[PDB]
């Protein structure tokens, strides 16, 4: 999911 990719990117995950 795109939002998950955005979240992980900003979380360093």
């Amino acid at each position: 999911v795109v939002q998950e990719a955005l979240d992980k990117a900003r979380e360093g995950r």
Partner: antibody, heavy 121, light 112 residues
Framework: EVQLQQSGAELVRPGASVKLSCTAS????????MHWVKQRPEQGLEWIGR????????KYAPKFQDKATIIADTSSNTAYLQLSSLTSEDTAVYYC??????????????WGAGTTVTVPS | DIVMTQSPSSLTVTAGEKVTMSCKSS????????????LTWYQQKPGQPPKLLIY???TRESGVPDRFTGSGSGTDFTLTISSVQAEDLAVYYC?????????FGAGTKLEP
């Protein structure tokens, strides 16, 4: 003021490769996913893929995995799209777009003017 | 892969006319985690790149005139233009911004 500057028209022979540039101005690409989209003459939009300049994390549409390579140079604030083993089917306008990361969510809000690549039959 | 189907393929418009365009996805674009539909609408004029109009199905991008209204949820989306202006002649595309690969509809062309 924010914009994406794209390189000039490219006339390339079949079998060769070409690298298109997308230079950001007004913001640093390390804070944005940089996308590439293809559009054949009289046709619709085809997403190619994107890269996260901060860590070089990439994601491609399966159909372009073997054709495109997306890279970024934070120093020159430029994103790139390299197309390999060119064929006439690669003839199209290639747009770059950005997705900023400061917003919880933001769409592809800023787009470049596009670069036309022409590969004769 | 999510297929985006837009209709009508084209529409002959006149100034001041009200028009509606449909965009249907083969899979829901509603993110259950935040209850937002990841559907984006763009306007593309000849020789120009796509221009963002609305995102999350109904949120208008700053600067976009109020005559443009996006609506719908799940798999059924609509772009409405209350009163067509000459500057509105273009192709309108909807885009699945929910999951990879990102995909676009074939667009609805507003013609003279």
């Amino acid at each position: 003021e924010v914009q994406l500057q794209q390189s000039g028209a490219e006339l390339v022979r079949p079998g060769a490769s070409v690298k298109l540039s997308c230079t950001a101005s007004g913001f640093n690409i390390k804070d944005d996913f940089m996308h590439w989209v293809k559009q054949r003459p009289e046709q619709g939009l085809e997403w190619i893929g994107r890269i996260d300049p901060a860590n070089d994390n990439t994601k491609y549409a399966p159909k372009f995995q073997d054709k495109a390579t997306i890279i970024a140079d934070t120093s020159s604030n430029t994103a790139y799209l390299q197309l390999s083993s060119l064929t006439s089917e690669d003839t199209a306008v290639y747009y770059c777009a950005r997705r900023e990361l400061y917003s919880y969510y933001s769409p592809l809000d800023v787009w470049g003017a596009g670069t036309t690549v022409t590969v004769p039959s | 892969d999510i297929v985006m189907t837009q209709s009508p393929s084209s529409l002959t418009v006149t100034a001041g006319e009200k028009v509606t365009m449909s965009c249907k996805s083969s899979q829901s674009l509603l993110n259950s985690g935040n209850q937002k539909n990841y559907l984006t609408w763009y306007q593309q004029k000849p020789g120009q790149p796509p221009k963002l109009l609305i995102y999350w199905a109904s949120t208008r991008e700053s600067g976009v005139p109020d005559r443009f209204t996006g609506s719908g949820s799940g798999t059924d989306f609509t772009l409405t233009i209350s009163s067509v202006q000459a500057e509105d002649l273009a192709v309108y595309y909807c885009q699945n911004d929910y999951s990879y690969p990102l995909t676009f509809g074939a667009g609805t062309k507003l013609e003279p």
